[PDB]
Amino acid sequence: TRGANVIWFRHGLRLHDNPALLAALADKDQGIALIPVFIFDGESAGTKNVGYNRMRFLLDSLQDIDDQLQAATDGRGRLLVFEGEPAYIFRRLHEQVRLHRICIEQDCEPIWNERDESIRSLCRELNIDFVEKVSHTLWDPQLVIETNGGIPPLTYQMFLHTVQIIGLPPRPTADARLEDATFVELDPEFCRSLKLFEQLPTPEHFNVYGDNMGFLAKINWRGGETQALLLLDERLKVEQHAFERGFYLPNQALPNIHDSPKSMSAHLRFGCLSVRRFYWSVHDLFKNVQLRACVRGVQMTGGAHITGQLIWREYFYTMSVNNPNYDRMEGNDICLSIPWAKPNENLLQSWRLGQTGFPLIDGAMRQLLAEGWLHHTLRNTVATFLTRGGLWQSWEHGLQHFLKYLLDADWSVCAGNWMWVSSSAFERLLDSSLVTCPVALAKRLDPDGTYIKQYVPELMNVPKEFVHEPWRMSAEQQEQYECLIGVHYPERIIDLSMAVKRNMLAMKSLRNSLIT
Amino acid sequence: MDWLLATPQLYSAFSSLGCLEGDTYVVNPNALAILEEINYKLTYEDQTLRTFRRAIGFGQNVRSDLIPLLENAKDDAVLESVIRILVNLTVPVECLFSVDVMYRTDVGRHTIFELNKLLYTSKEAFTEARSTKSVVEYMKHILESDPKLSPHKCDQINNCLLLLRNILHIPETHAHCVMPMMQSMPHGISMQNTILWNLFIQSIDKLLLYLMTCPQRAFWGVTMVQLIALIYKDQHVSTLQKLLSLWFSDSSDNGSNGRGMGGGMREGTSPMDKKELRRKKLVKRSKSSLINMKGLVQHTPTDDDISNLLKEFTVDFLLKGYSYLVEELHMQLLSNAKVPIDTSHFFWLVTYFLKFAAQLELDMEHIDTILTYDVLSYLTYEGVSLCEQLELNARQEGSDLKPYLRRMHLVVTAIREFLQAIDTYNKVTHLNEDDKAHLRQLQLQISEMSDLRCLFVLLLRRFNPSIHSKQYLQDLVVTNHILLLILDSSAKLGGCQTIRLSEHITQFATLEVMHYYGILLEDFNNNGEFVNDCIFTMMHHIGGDLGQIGVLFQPIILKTYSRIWEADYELCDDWSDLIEYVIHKFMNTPPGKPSDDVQILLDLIIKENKAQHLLWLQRILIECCFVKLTLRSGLKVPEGDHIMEPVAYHCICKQKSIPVVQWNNEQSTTMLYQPFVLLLHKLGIQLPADAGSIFARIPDYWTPETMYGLAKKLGPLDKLNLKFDASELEDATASSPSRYHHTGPRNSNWLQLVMRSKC
Numbered sequence A: 001t002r003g004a005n006v007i008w009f010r011h012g013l014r015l016h017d018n019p020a021l022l023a024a025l026a027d028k029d030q031g032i033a034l035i036p037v038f039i040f041d042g043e044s045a046g047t048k049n050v051g052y053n054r055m056r057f058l059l060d061s062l063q064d065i066d067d068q069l070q071a072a073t074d075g076r077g078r079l080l081v082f083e084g085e086p087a088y089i090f091r092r093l094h095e096q097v098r099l100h101r102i103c104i105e106q107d108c109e110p111i112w113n114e115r116d117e118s119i120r121s122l123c124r125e126l127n128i129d130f131v132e133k134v135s136h137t138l139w140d141p142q143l144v145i146e147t148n149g150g151i152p153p154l155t156y157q158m159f160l161h162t163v164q165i166i167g168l169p170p171r172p173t174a175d176a177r178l179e180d181a182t183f184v185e186l187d188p189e190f191c192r193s194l195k196l197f198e199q200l201p202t203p204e205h206f207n208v209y210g211d212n213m214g215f216l217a218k219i220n221w222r223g224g225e226t227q228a229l230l231l232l233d234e235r236l237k238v239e240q241h242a243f244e245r246g247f248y249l250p251n252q253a254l255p256n257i258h259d260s261p262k263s264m265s266a267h268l269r270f271g272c273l274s275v276r277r278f279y280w281s282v283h284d285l286f287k288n289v290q291l292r293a294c295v296r297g298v299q300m301t302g303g304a305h306i307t308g309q310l311i312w313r314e315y316f317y318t319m320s321v322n323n324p325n326y327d328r329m330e331g332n333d334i335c336l337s338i339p340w341a342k343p344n345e346n347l348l349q350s351w352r353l354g355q356t357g358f359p360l361i362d363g364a365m366r367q368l369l370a371e372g373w374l375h376h377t378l379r380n381t382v383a384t385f386l387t388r389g390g391l392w393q394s395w396e397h398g399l400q401h402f403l404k405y406l407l408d409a410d411w412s413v414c415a416g417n418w419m420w421v422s423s424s425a426f427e428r429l430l431d432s433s434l435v436t437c438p439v440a441l442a443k444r445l446d447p448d449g450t451y452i453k454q455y456v457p458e459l460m461n462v463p464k465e466f467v468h469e470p471w472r473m474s475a476e477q478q479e480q481y482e483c484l485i486g487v488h489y490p491e492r493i494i495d496l497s498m499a500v501k502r503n504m505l506a507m508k509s510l511r512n513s514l515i516t
Numbered sequence B: 001m002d003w004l005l006a007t008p009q010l011y012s013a014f015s016s017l018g019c020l021e022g023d024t025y026v027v028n029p030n031a032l033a034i035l036e037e038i039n040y041k042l043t044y045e046d047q048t049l050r051t052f053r054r055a056i057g058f059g060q061n062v063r064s065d066l067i068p069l070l071e072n073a074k075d076d077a078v079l080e081s082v083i084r085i086l087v088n089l090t091v092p093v094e095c096l097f098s099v100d101v102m103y104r105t106d107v108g109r110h111t112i113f114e115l116n117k118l119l120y121t122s123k124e125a126f127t128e129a130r131s132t133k134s135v136v137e138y139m140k141h142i143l144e145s146d147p148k149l150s151p152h153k154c155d156q157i158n159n160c161l162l163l164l165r166n167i168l169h170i171p172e173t174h175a176h177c178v179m180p181m182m183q184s185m186p187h188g189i190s191m192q193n194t195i196l197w198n199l200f201i202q203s204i205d206k207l208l209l210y211l212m213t214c215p216q217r218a219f220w221g222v223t224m225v226q227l228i229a230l231i232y233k234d235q236h237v238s239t240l241q242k243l244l245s246l247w248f249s250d251s252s253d254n255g256s257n258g259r260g261m262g263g264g265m266r267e268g269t270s271p272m273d274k275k276e277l278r279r280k281k282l283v284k285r286s287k288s289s290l291i292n293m294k295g296l297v298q299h300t301p302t303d304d305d306i307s308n309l310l311k312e313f314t315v316d317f318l319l320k321g322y323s324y325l326v327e328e329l330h331m332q333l334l335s336n337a338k339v340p341i342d343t344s345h346f347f348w349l350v351t352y353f354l355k356f357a358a359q360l361e362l363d364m365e366h367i368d369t370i371l372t373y374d375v376l377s378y379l380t381y382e383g384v385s386l387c388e389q390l391e392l393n394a395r396q397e398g399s400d401l402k403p404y405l406r407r408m409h410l411v412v413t414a415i416r417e418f419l420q421a422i423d424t425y426n427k428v429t430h431l432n433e434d435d436k437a438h439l440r441q442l443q444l445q446i447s448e449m450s451d452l453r454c455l456f457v458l459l460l461r462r463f464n465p466s467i468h469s470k471q472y473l474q475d476l477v478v479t480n481h482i483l484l485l486i487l488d489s490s491a492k493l494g495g496c497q498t499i500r501l502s503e504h505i506t507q508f509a510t511l512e513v514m515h516y517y518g519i520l521l522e523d524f525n526n527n528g529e530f531v532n533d534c535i536f537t538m539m540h541h542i543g544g545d546l547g548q549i550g551v552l553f554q555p556i557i558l559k560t561y562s563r564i565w566e567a568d569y570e571l572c573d574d575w576s577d578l579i580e581y582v583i584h585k586f587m588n589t590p591p592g593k594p595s596d597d598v599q600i601l602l603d604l605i606i607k608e609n610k611a612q613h614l615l616w617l618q619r620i621l622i623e624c625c626f627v628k629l630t631l632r633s634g635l636k637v638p639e640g641d642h643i644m645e646p647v648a649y650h651c652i653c654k655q656k657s658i659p660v661v662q663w664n665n666e667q668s669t670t671m672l673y674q675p676f677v678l679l680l681h682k683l684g685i686q687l688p689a690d691a692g693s694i695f696a697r698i699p700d701y702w703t704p705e706t707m708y709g710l711a712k713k714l715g716p717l718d719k720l721n722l723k724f725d726a727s728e729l730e731d732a733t734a735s736s737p738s739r740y741h742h743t744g745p746r747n748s749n750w751l752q753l754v755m756r757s758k759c
């Protein structure tokens, strides 16, 4: 037996900046081979409740890894795709070929704690070393907790100081030299007995059927490493336009809706693009745009404002590793028990299917069902319409629906964002400030009404003056323009002005009753 | 950065502030609620982080929402709220938590850059003429809405003035943080020109003139003078002079910025038929120019156009707004409350505009209340007290320095401009004999005065060449020559040298004036034929007119004495008896109640072989009873002749110490000699070391009927000075004993709330 090493892609679906693969590619001179394995256990990579868009994104990314391996190894090496219990597969793989160590990427979320402990107990009882490198995050979340003093940092400014004394996150590592790696061919009988996928399957194989709604996806989303790097060239150009202008974060400085997206959320979550590579490629772009434009009038200042959203994604990761109930309220010591209304399936299905009667909320919710990605402002206005400024429902319903249909469904990030918009856990707690009104925000994100007309196909003849507020359109204009409210486009399911004023009355009462 | 998760809320609120339907802008009905929520969030935010203000800066919501909302508002309440929010928004960073101490760290300079970018972008938003048009229209609507102004309306007017001042104060970010190149001059030099041009197209000059003409000017005089100081920034006095020659609730914004913070940069360096014709030319060319520039509201705004505009403003400003502004500022500075008015603005006002009033031979009936003894008396009081504060805070580090240097440089020029205007009006003989008699009597009161006369000994002896500039020495010696000339024309004729020059210019000639006078010859070409002409005349009174010749040869300036001897700048005969006649004197060199322990102190003074140190100060402790006797009397006697000691009046109504400052060295170092201090600590008087300075204190409240018996034992009883009449009050010190007992110097959370709720 020559021996073989096992790299498992629970996440971090890439080859560049993979410390797990660097440990996998080590011990070459002894004769230890390499086995790349993906396991479809129904839980890994967010497959418990997965829509057609995210399942295609995972399936397209697996083809890109297989195409990368078949190009560097000229067909000698290929990805192995399985479907079964991970403890059963690794035990049978250890019997055929003697393993040496299983190297993974560290998934810090506690929903993978039961899976990791089962694997950790398996290798310890089989005299197999366990390797768990961390590359999904800039800093180790358990390291931040230990340096803070046994309690996670409960403030963004307190978390920013905690990572200041930790140091800068590490630079991206080298690229794996898979051109000389040893791959082992298995017995074909062992492949059918272990449910090995001889070809890459379809999303219909996992009972995830493509809906008829996805015809109106104006843009197309493609996963994998190759699409992650080509889009990275496009977003850094967007950054360079803002860097020569004097401001940062162009996605939240100039909010553009009716164009191609410039977000590294889907590729970064699945690991098609390394976060550390994304962190440093936009900081080194900021470093040499400060130096060579210092002769010009505009001079930069430096700091962490360039990647201010990446610290936010680590803030939710830090206060979720030790909280197994991070996605709910019962047993959760971070969020209050806000008395939401009784869960109404009629209002929820109207909100989920994009039939609420508000053109921005209808346009945004139909975009998620068709493409799987929204803008951050578009995600905030549909999370405020359901929890605070509107239906007054529980955020757990919106969190579960977001986790099923998002292209970037991160368990710690989405639950943290849903508990911020509802304002139940973090700072600016129980705020009685102005809520995100969809009527006013639609009139200036897309004043022309192009984006609303794109995703709502019932408003072709509706002009730009009436498309944001079709309820102001008269009955005579409704007949001649094919915008009959109630039979073509739904009426507003709730009164927005009455519901907003009612909720802040209950919001102020909770704040007053919080004291004593 | 961390408002990123709160960005869509602010975006929605600012989008809902104002919605556009077709061509008519319509405001939201709940715009007042949205604006008051925004103002409450901005005022009650974190002091150090300033996260909400940086959020407004990052979102660029100002030019997108607030400027159109200010432009197209109609109701007064929404306009007032928008004005208040804008005023709270465009506060200069220097008025915000003293940015220089926390600028050092990277997060600190990032915050400074973010706030400065917000200020610059708000100024770029305000460069549009419609925003200033809306503000000027709001001004006019408040002003002629009703003849009587409510205090709330006065506060709104005040807010508008603060908005204008803040907008004009923003370019300090543009001045140095931008650091323009040749590709940034055509926009950078024209941003302020466009701001001023749009201000004057909407006739802000008439608004300001009516504002100072309004009787309610006390509500906004401080912001009025601050905006006047901020109107001129890069327009020097040279081009103005050439044009005048060519003529013929923890946090807030109002107080969280009004802590002085005076704009720096120095913001400075028949004939009557002709005045009549030039007044008609003023109004005619002003109206023709105004219709021309409203024809050219978009044009090339240049610096000479700005200079002409400021000329047409300042010519009528000196005519009508001068006295009405400065007398209100003087009355507000005389108020007993803790005033927030920056004194350097008032000093700048008198220096910068008195030369404009004097050069144009402006007729007196606007300027009588300004060219007066009271403002000069207050000027010398503030000079004494400001040098007091400077030498108090010089020992202990950690205080401001450059504001103190600029305040010195402004109070010294203020003495220069008054007496220069007095001399220029003496030169002019067009004025009648009544104002001639007024000028002669004011010159008499300046003659018999004693406080500004050795104020120059004060700033020539406590001067440090390492703490000031070369122009300060030039300015000071110009004031020396000017006051000496006032003493030579105003006192020899008008008073018959009552200060007894040979005794009193021995308070000059102390050789601490000789060294810094000698630095003037080191820069002798910088003075030209103006200030070089000043100094040998002072030298001539010392060398030729006083009996001191062998002493005026100091080794540091003996070589510079040879520098004139090798230059030989064709000097006249008034001082060729100095450069040529005295060089031969070194070319051929000779190389209970009554007498007590106090009596043992007063004869010790005689053991110093002289008693001139007593009468030098003793007159002041004779005078300590008088001023609060007159305040007790409440009547008027022939004032001016009865000088009342300008260093004493403007602190005794403020009831503080009335210090005897050091003046001249043979009497100054006596305030370290125990013989003088012995009577200054026997009965109990605050030592200067307790006050931190080296000016000896004279405190107050000792019941001025008591301030003559202890004063009688002090020195002789030379009553040649009949500057007092206390026939009733010469009775209650010894004949009313034990009114004060024998007392001397004797001392006498979010996770937290979550937990709370869930539990």
Ligand SMILES: Cc1cc2nc3c(=O)[nH]c(=O)nc-3n(C[C@H](O)[C@H](O)[C@H](O)COP(=O)(O)OP(=O)(O)OC[C@H]3O[C@@H](n4cnc5c(N)ncnc54)[C@H](O)[C@@H]3O)c2cc1C
Residues within 6 Å of the ligand: A251, A252, A262, A263, A264, A265, A266, A268, A269, A309, A310, A312, A313, A316, A374, A375, A376, A379, A380, A383, A402, A406, A408, A409, A410, A413, A414, A417, A418, A421, B004, B005
């Ligand atoms: C209701 C709601 C749901 C969200 N769900 C997700 C999700 O499922 N997956 C996801 O990656 N992001 C989520 N976010 C954060 C953010 O809206 C999305 O990542 C968005 O696509 C990024 O937009 P961008 O291009 O401006 O930033 P990007 O360049 O896309 O951001 C890059 C990285 O920064 C992180 N990030 C950026 N903004 C935030 C934020 N406000 N809070 C937390 N993390 C942030 C993201 O996790 C991402 O990996 C959600 C936000 C809201 C309000």
